[PDB]
C-alpha cells in the first residue's frame, strides 16, 4: 500500500495560474509549467493515508466529491468499491449545512422508487406517470452516490478543492475534515490532509483514488482485487 | 440548563408595490452563567417566530469564556466596524457596570464584576457583535504560556 515510481505519471500541472500558497510543494518551472515536488507529495501522502486507515478501520464515512469531467466516472466506481457515498454530477448548496433538507429529497427518491416497484405505477394517470418518471430520473442522477449518507460524513475527499470550494467551505463550517487532491491552483491551507498532484490528467487520478480505496478496504480486512477503474484510462 | 435574555426587536420594514411589508429582527443572548454564552439574530415575518430563530442561532456559535473569580483575566478593546467595546476586569463587590446590551451578554456569561465602556458607534447590534469577539479573544495565563512554550 504505497507507490514510489509514480513520477512516471503525476509530475506537474497548471503552467502558471498558481496560487502562491502552493509554493511549498513546487519543485521548479520546467518548459513553463509548475512541476510539483515529488518527495513532498509522498510526505503529505503518508500523513494523509494514516488518517484514512485510522478513520477507515474505525468505521467512519468518507464523502468522495468530484465534479470534473476527468474525475466523474472514476469517483463513481471507487466510491462504489468502498461503502462510501459520492457526489458526481453537481455539488448542491447545503448538502452538508442543509443536510437535513437535502436528505428529504432522498426520502422522495426512495418513495418514488418504492412506488415504481409497486403495481400502482399504472393506477395513476398517464400524465402523472411521466411527471413522476422525470422525478426519479433526475433524483437518481444527482443523488446516486449521495443516497448512502445516513448522517453527516466523518470525512470529505475532493479532487479539485478549487472547483469544489463550495463543498470544502461547508466541511470547514461543519468542522468536517477535508482530504484533497490539490495541484498548483489550489489553496493548501483549506485542506486538512492534502495530496499535491494533478487535478486533471485522469492517468494520475485513477491511481490516487484506487490506492485510496485499496487502503480503506485493507483497514477493514476485505482485501480486494485490482480496481475496475483502470479500463477508463483510454 | 440554558437561560436566554432578549436584547432588542425591530420592525425592519421593506417596500413593495401597494404598501410596505415588514420582517422582524430579534437579538437573543443565550448563556449558562458557567462561562458559555451565545448570540443569535433572528428574522421572521411574525415577532415570536423571530425570537425562536434567535434562540436557535444563539445556541450555535457559542463562546467559551475564561471566568477568573467572576471576571475577565485582562482588559481588551474590540473594534467591530465603527463600534468599539472596552472591557476591564473588576474586583468583586463592584458588579456589572455596562450598557443595556453588554450587561445582558456578560450576565449570561457568568461575569459578576466587570467595567465596560461603549465607544464610537453605539449601535446595539454592532456592540453585541463587538462584545462577542472581545470574549473570543480572551486568553488565560495557561493559554498564553502554552503559546510561548515552543
Amino acid at each position: 500500500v504505497k507507490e514510489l515510481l509514480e513520477a512516471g505519471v503525476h509530475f506537474g500541472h497548471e503552467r502558471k495560474r498558481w496560487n502562491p500558497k502552493f509554493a511549498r510543494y513546487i519543485y521548479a518551472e520546467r518548459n513553463g509549467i509548475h512541476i510539483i515536488d515529488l518527495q513532498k507529495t509522498m510526505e503529505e501522502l503518508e500523513r494523509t493515508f494514516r488518517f484514512i486507515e485510522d478513520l477507515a478501520m474505525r468505521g467512519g464515512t468518507i464523502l468522495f466529491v468530484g465534479t470534473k469531467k476527468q474525475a466523474q466516472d472514476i469517483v463513481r466506481m471507487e466510491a462504489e468499491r468502498a461503502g462510501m457515498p459520492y457526489v458526481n454530477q453537481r455539488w448542491l448548496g447545503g448538502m452538508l449545512t442543509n443536510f437535513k433538507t437535502i436528505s428529504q429529497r432522498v426520502h422522495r427518491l426512495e418513495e418514488l422508487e418504492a412506488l415504481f416497484a409497486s403495481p400502482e405505477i399504472e393506477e395513476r394517470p398517464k400524465k402523472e406517470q411521466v411527471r413522476l418518471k422525470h422525478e426519479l430520473e433526475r433524483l437518481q442522477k444527482y443523488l446516486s452516490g449521495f443516497r448512502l449518507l445516513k448522517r453527516l460524513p466523518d470525512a470529505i475527499f475532493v479532487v479539485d478543492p478549487t472547483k469544489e470550494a463550495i463543498a470544502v467551505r461547508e466541511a470547514r463550517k461543519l468542522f468536517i475534515p477535508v482530504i484533497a487532491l490539490a495541484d498548483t491552483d489550489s489553496d493548501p491551507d483549506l485542506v486538512d490532509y492534502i495530496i499535491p498532484g494533478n487535478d486533471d490528467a485522469i492517468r494520475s487520478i485513477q491511481l490516487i483514488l484506487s490506492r485510496a480505496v485499496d487502503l480503506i478496504i485493507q483497514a477493514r480486512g476485505g482485501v480486494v482485487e485490482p480496481s475496475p477503474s483502470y479500463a477508463l484510462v483510454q | 440548563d440554558f437561560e436566554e435574555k432578549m436584547i432588542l426587536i425591530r420592525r425592519t420594514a421593506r417596500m413593495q408595490a401597494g404598501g410596505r411589508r415588514f420582517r422582524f429582527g430579534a437579538l437573543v443572548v443565550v448563556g449558562d452563567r458557567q462561562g458559555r454564552v451565545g448570540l443569535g439574530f433572528g428574522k421572521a415575518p411574525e415577532v415570536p417566530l423571530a425570537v425562536q430563530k434567535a434562540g436557535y442561532y444563539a445556541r450555535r456559535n457559542m463562546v467559551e469564556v475564561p471566568l477568573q473569580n467572576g471576571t475577565i483575566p485582562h482588559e481588551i478593546e474590540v473594534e467591530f466596524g465603527a463600534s468599539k467595546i472596552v472591557l476591564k476586569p473588576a474586583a468583586p463587590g463592584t458588579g456589572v457596570i455596562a450598557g443595556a446590551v453588554p450587561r445582558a451578554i456578560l450576565e449570561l456569561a457568568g461575569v459578576t464584576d466587570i467595567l465596560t465602556k461603549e465607544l464610537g458607534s453605539r449601535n446595539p447590534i454592532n456592540i453585541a457583535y463587538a462584545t462577542m469577539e472581545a470574549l473570543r479573544q480572551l486568553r488565560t495565563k495557561a493559554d498564553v504560556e502554552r503559546l510561548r512554550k515552543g
Binding site: - | P92, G93, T94, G95, T112
Partner: protein, 208 residues
Amino acid sequence: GRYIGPVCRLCRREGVKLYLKGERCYSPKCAMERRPYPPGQHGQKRARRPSDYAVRLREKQKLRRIYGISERQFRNLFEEASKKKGVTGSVFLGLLESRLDNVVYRLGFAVSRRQARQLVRHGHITVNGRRVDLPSYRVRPGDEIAVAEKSRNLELIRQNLEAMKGRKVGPWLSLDVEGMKGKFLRLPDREDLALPVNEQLVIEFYSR
C-alpha cells in the same frame, strides 16, 4: 420622618412578604395571603416585562422598604459602604443590620421594625447602661442592648419576651431573656441574612 401609612400594601407591590407588620404577616391575613398582586386598579392586569432599570429599581425598594428608612439615610449608608474596604454588597447589609432600631427587632424585643423604632425613640432601649433614643444609632460589636428597668414592668415588653421563650436568635446575636439584656456579637455575614434581595442588583442601581 419615615414612611407612615398602609404597610401590607407594600408587601404586595414588591411581590414578596414584608414582615414590617410584625405579626399578622405570619397569620393568613398579611394580604400576601390570597392577594399577591400589586395594589391599585390595574393590579390584576398582566404586568409588562420590566426594563433593565425597572428590575434594579424594584430591588432597591424591596431592600429599603424592609428596614423602614428614607432614601436619604439609605443612600448615605451606601456611599459609606463603597469607600470602606471589602465587598460593597455585604458591608452595606451589615451596616443596615447595625441600626439600633433594626437590632431591637432582630433581638426580638419588638414584634416589627416600626415597633422597634418607637421603642428606641421613647428611650426604652439601653445601650451599655446609657439610654439611646436614636433609631439610627449604629451598634458596634460587643455592645449590650438592654431594656430600661423603668420599662421592664411594661406589659408590652413582658409580652414579646414571653413568646421569645425558647426562641432562637441570630448567630451574631445573643440575649438574656429574664434580665431583658442583649448583645451584638459580630457583624452578620451575607449568609447570616435570609433577606430576599439581590445586592448586586442594588449596587447596579447606583452605578447610574
